[PDB]
Subunit: 142 residues, 3 copies
């Protein structure tokens, strides 16, 4: 048997209506729900300054970082990022966000990037499903 | 060196022409193909009463449950659900379905839900790619 | 602690501008980026001989095999293929590609196949996200 511990980042509570866990530590594997820039996108757009894809990607990767750190991990634990965009033209902005986020770090996670037809809120331009485990570090890759 | 076993559910016969396996037990991981409410959805549509996203989501989760059980597992082994919908407005219907399906159960699997442009049959509103491990039980989440 | 090593296939250079790794061997797990038939698809389309979905899926599966081989593996190591197509009508063409690619074994990887609204190059009809482990062989399941 392998222990499952639910990971809680204070900024990302699993609210009463939700039928998912944001993060579950299953052995060394940090299993994460897809992350989006909501509600920061909601506020920002309502105030007449919607977040572009680059800003949204950084907000999303920041959420992933928060989950990792809440579980006792770090950005180097990430081994794969599945990126869903609403506009394939935004792929380069996502790349730029990743270059900044992983500025560390000699080696990037694997990735798949596709354009989907829609995300859970209309302000969103991107959602990232991240995969990590706490027993690896890409920063020191063989 | 790791054992793999083909897992077949009685309720869901694998057809000999398919270029995929419904389920493979790879060590303690139960690797599943995406599940849909077809062909129940075709019959329903043809009889003039198509399955809504709630009904389809329950059919889908029932198939995931059948595969788990065929492996000697249970619904508590699930740690992630990737949900693909054809209409993002159905996200709440899918949520209602998950609340029912996991009525057990303290802790929900992680999730990503996106709207895709199309599914393999035109009557479909949802497909779920489910991830599970036989050595965990989310009912015992810390 | 689990060792990770970056796997480099010659035919699939990681280009230093990329913010992803084509393949990472993480213990026994070969973690791979999504594979597409670009740039072969661009050459083919320019030539007036655009690759159809079946041809593209085979090029993609060949790339996956190149990555597997670069890590000392083989196609029996594959246990899941998630397939993103631009046209759902092409699902059977992906099926045909798989039957040919897996001609040597009876047991296929698990799969999810969905239609996306776009891929990273306009000539693309398919992208496949492949999951593999070096310590399994699906051919052992055949019954």
């Amino acid at each position: 048997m392998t222990a499952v511990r639910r990971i809680r980042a204070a900024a990302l509570p699993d609210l009463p209506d939700a039928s998912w866990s944001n993060a579950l530590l299953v052995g060394e594997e940090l299993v994460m729900s897809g992350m989006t820039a909501h509600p920061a996108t909601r506020q920002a757009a309502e105030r007449g300054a919607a977040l572009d894809a680059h800003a949204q990607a950084l907000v999303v990767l920041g959420k992933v970082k928060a989950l990792l750190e809440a579980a006792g991990g770090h950005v180097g634990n990430l081994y794969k990022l599945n990126v869903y965009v609403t506009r394939i033209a935004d792929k380069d902005a996502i790349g730029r966000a990743r270059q900044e986020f992983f500025a560390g770090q000699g080696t990037f996670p694997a990735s798949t990037l596709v354009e989907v037809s829609g995300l859970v809120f209309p302000e969103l331009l991107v959602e990232i499903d991240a995969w990590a485990r706490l027993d690896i570090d890409l920063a020191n890759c063989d």
